[PDB]
Write a protein that holds these residues in place. Structure first.
Motif, PDB file in Angstrom:
ATOM      1  N   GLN A   2       0.702  -1.203  -0.196  1.00 25.22           N
ATOM      2  CA  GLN A   2      -0.092  -0.136   0.027  1.00 25.22           C
ATOM      3  C   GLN A   2       0.836   1.236  -0.137  1.00 25.22           C
ATOM      4  OE1 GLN A   2      -3.938   0.546   0.748  1.00 25.22           O
ATOM      5  NE2 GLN A   2      -3.686  -0.849  -0.830  1.00 25.22           N
ATOM      6  N   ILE A   3       2.101   1.186   0.040  1.00 26.35           N
ATOM      7  CA  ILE A   3       3.226   2.288  -0.007  1.00 26.35           C
ATOM      8  C   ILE A   3       3.667   2.108  -1.339  1.00 26.35           C
ATOM      9  CG2 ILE A   3       4.787   3.381   1.098  1.00 26.35           C
ATOM     10  CD1 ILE A   3       4.321   2.677   3.644  1.00 26.35           C
ATOM     11  N   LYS A   4       3.264   2.625  -2.049  1.00 27.05           N
ATOM     12  CA  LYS A   4       3.472   2.766  -3.643  1.00 27.05           C
ATOM     13  C   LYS A   4       4.260   4.117  -4.094  1.00 27.05           C
ATOM     14  CE  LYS A   4      -0.674   0.371  -4.876  1.00 27.05           C
ATOM     15  NZ  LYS A   4      -0.168  -1.044  -4.171  1.00 27.05           N
ATOM     16  N   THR A   5       4.166   5.280  -3.473  1.00 28.71           N
ATOM     17  CA  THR A   5       4.519   6.491  -3.942  1.00 28.71           C
ATOM     18  C   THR A   5       5.484   6.940  -2.992  1.00 28.71           C
ATOM     19  OG1 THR A   5       2.431   7.045  -3.554  1.00 28.71           O
ATOM     20  CG2 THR A   5       2.799   7.016  -5.746  1.00 28.71           C
ATOM     21  N   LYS A   6       6.304   7.829  -3.541  1.00 25.55           N
ATOM     22  CA  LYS A   6       6.911   8.946  -2.848  1.00 25.55           C
ATOM     23  C   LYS A   6       6.086   9.652  -1.705  1.00 25.55           C
ATOM     24  CE  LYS A   6       9.954  10.169  -6.623  1.00 25.55           C
ATOM     25  NZ  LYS A   6      10.063   8.552  -7.026  1.00 25.55           N
ATOM     26  N   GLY A   7       4.871  10.062  -1.928  1.00 20.91           N
ATOM     27  CA  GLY A   7       4.141  10.747  -0.982  1.00 20.91           C
ATOM     28  C   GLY A   7       3.745   9.726  -0.064  1.00 20.91           C
ATOM     29  N   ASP A   8       3.666   8.174  -0.412  1.00 21.26           N
ATOM     30  CA  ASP A   8       2.971   7.561   0.823  1.00 21.26           C
ATOM     31  C   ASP A   8       4.216   7.114   1.604  1.00 21.26           C
ATOM     32  OD1 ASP A   8       0.845   7.176  -0.727  1.00 21.26           O
ATOM     33  OD2 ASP A   8       1.320   5.066  -1.085  1.00 21.26           O
ATOM     34  N   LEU A   9       5.603   7.193   1.292  1.00 23.28           N
ATOM     35  CA  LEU A   9       6.801   7.261   2.026  1.00 23.28           C
ATOM     36  C   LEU A   9       6.762   8.316   3.048  1.00 23.28           C
ATOM     37  CD1 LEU A   9       9.781   6.013  -0.134  1.00 23.28           C
ATOM     38  CD2 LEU A   9       8.337   4.670   1.507  1.00 23.28           C
ATOM     39  N   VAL A  10       6.650   9.622   2.406  1.00 26.92           N
ATOM     40  CA  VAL A  10       6.393  10.916   3.301  1.00 26.92           C
ATOM     41  C   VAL A  10       5.506  10.745   4.337  1.00 26.92           C
ATOM     42  CG1 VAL A  10       6.318  13.388   2.999  1.00 26.92           C
ATOM     43  CG2 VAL A  10       7.632  12.059   1.519  1.00 26.92           C
ATOM     44  N   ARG A  11       4.135  10.437   3.934  1.00 21.98           N
ATOM     45  CA  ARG A  11       3.169  10.441   5.107  1.00 21.98           C
ATOM     46  C   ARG A  11       3.514   9.240   5.996  1.00 21.98           C
ATOM     47  NH1 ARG A  11      -0.166  11.713   0.601  1.00 21.98           N
ATOM     48  NH2 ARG A  11      -0.666   9.566  -0.173  1.00 21.98           N
ATOM     49  N   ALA A  12       4.152   8.073   5.597  1.00 23.54           N
ATOM     50  CA  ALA A  12       4.227   7.166   6.711  1.00 23.54           C
ATOM     51  C   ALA A  12       5.547   7.925   7.570  1.00 23.54           C
ATOM     52  CB  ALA A  12       5.176   5.681   6.062  1.00 23.54           C
ATOM     53  N   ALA A  13       6.575   8.592   7.008  1.00 26.54           N
ATOM     54  CA  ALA A  13       7.511   8.984   7.908  1.00 26.54           C
ATOM     55  C   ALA A  13       6.982  10.327   8.737  1.00 26.54           C
ATOM     56  CB  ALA A  13       8.748   9.571   6.996  1.00 26.54           C
ATOM     57  N   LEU A  14       5.988  10.935   8.293  1.00 28.19           N
ATOM     58  CA  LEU A  14       5.407  12.034   9.258  1.00 28.19           C
ATOM     59  C   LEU A  14       4.604  11.248  10.443  1.00 28.19           C
ATOM     60  CD1 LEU A  14       4.396  14.602   6.642  1.00 28.19           C
ATOM     61  CD2 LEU A  14       6.197  14.656   8.170  1.00 28.19           C
ATOM     62  N   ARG A  15       3.841  10.143  10.245  1.00 29.88           N
ATOM     63  CA  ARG A  15       3.228   9.384  10.825  1.00 29.88           C
ATOM     64  C   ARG A  15       4.070   8.716  12.075  1.00 29.88           C
ATOM     65  NH1 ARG A  15       2.160   3.897  10.599  1.00 29.88           N
ATOM     66  NH2 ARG A  15       2.976   4.260   8.397  1.00 29.88           N
ATOM     67  N   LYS A  16       5.164   8.165  11.502  1.00 25.88           N
ATOM     68  CA  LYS A  16       6.251   7.528  12.561  1.00 25.88           C
ATOM     69  C   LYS A  16       6.774   8.658  13.452  1.00 25.88           C
ATOM     70  CE  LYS A  16       6.202   4.393  12.553  1.00 25.88           C
ATOM     71  NZ  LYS A  16       5.302   3.333  12.908  1.00 25.88           N
ATOM     72  N   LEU A  17       6.944   9.961  12.986  1.00 20.87           N
ATOM     73  CA  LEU A  17       7.238  11.260  13.573  1.00 20.87           C
ATOM     74  C   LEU A  17       6.025  11.652  14.675  1.00 20.87           C
ATOM     75  CD1 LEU A  17       9.599  13.332  11.656  1.00 20.87           C
ATOM     76  CD2 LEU A  17      10.211  12.220  13.752  1.00 20.87           C
ATOM     77  N   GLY A  18       4.949  11.346  14.473  1.00 17.75           N
ATOM     78  CA  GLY A  18       3.840  11.656  15.049  1.00 17.75           C
ATOM     79  C   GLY A  18       3.379  13.389  14.762  1.00 17.75           C
ATOM     80  N   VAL A  19       3.557  13.771  13.528  1.00 20.27           N
ATOM     81  CA  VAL A  19       3.595  15.067  13.102  1.00 20.27           C
ATOM     82  C   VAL A  19       2.192  15.237  12.400  1.00 20.27           C
ATOM     83  CG1 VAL A  19       4.252  16.547  11.304  1.00 20.27           C
ATOM     84  CG2 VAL A  19       5.885  15.809  13.028  1.00 20.27           C
ATOM     85  N   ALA A  20       1.654  14.358  11.547  1.00 20.16           N
ATOM     86  CA  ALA A  20       0.226  14.294  10.584  1.00 20.16           C
ATOM     87  C   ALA A  20       0.133  12.849  10.383  1.00 20.16           C
ATOM     88  CB  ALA A  20       0.924  15.185   9.359  1.00 20.16           C
TER      89      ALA A  20
END
Lengths: 152, 54
Positions: A2-20
């Motif tokens: 379900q992580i197919k795009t650079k934006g998916d990677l970025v959203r996952a990173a922000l979620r890991k960080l607890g920002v968005a």
């Protein structure tokens, strides 16, 4: 995946960080997404040192395409976690944050797993030196006058 | 040889003529092939490749 795009990677990173995320009611800021994508591209180009670094299958966006976001990253299924954990680590200081110990440990582990197979592949033994004979047991070579190894 | 019969053969003396054939040659017939040491399959195959070529 379900992580197919650079934006998916970025959203996952922000979620890991607890920002968005959705565990915390925050939407990804459009100003944050472009900065995180630029950081991802910089970090990926740094890793892939023009082919002599970590090979991951990531696809670098050219200047021609309008959205640097929306394009498939092209990673393998086993590189996503490593990439986005490292990305969260890299972009945490943007917000005066600090990725927690679990995130840092997972980033280290993921990068090592990224380089493991390439390390095995590059663990190659150099040929015999040019001054090493073949030995008389190599009958065909020592008959056809190949008494020494070529080298190089 | 041509042959005539008669008694008065003035102005009828033939000449001579000998024909010939030409024999020439074509182009070589090769068995170019490439031999590789460090194979153990080009070691046993080469010895028999020479004979098959002949």
């Amino acid at each position: 995946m379900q992580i197919k795009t650079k934006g998916d990677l970025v959203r996952a990173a922000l979620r890991k960080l607890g920002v968005a995320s959705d565990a915390t009611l925050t939407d990804v800021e459009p100003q944050s997404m472009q900065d995180a994508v630029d950081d991802l591209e910089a970090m990926m180009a740094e890793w892939y040192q023009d082919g002599k670094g970590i090979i991951t299958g990531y696809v670098f966006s050219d200047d021609e395409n309008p959205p640097a976001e929306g394009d498939d990253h092209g990673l393998r299924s086993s590189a996503v976690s490593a990439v986005f954990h490292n990305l969260a680590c890299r972009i945490a200081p943007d917000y005066a944050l600090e990725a927690t110990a679990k995130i840092i440990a997972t980033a280290k582990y993921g990068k090592e797993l990224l380089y493991k197979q390439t390390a095995i592949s590059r663990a190659k033994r150099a040929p015999y030196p040019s001054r090493m004979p073949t030995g008389s047991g190599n009958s065909f070579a020592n008959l056809n006058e190949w008494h020494y190894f070529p080298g190089e | 040889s041509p042959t005539q019969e008669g008694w008065d053969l003035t102005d009828k003396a033939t000449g001579l003529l000998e024909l010939n054939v030409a024999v020439n040659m074509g182009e070589p017939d090769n068995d170019f092939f490439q031999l590789r040491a460090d194979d153990l399959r080009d070691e046993t195959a080469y010895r028999r490749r020479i004979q098959s070529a002949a």
